[PDB]
Amino acid sequence: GQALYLEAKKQVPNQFSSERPVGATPAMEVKTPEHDPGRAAQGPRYEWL
């Protein structure tokens, strides 16, 4: 199937639409802390399944 689809897109033009790519761009950000986060005193005490 995929092979025949490729042959069609190749040999048979005007059979399909293609302004498909818009508003995407991949993004991957990371940043290390600059200040000490500190310490807390509230922790878990229950669990639900």
């Binding site: 993004a27 950000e29 990371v30 940043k31 802390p33 600059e34 878990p44």
Partner: protein, 48 residues
Amino acid sequence: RDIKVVLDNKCRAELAMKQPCSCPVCNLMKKITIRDSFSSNYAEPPKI
């Protein structure tokens, strides 16, 4: 998304920031664990 609709928030999580976002949306999902799931009774190919 459902919990944000319920609590009426507009959080985006802004990917990586200087400090953790806090706020209830990011304070409740930080303590929720969800298992992945699979189709228990269906394995046939789908329709077009």
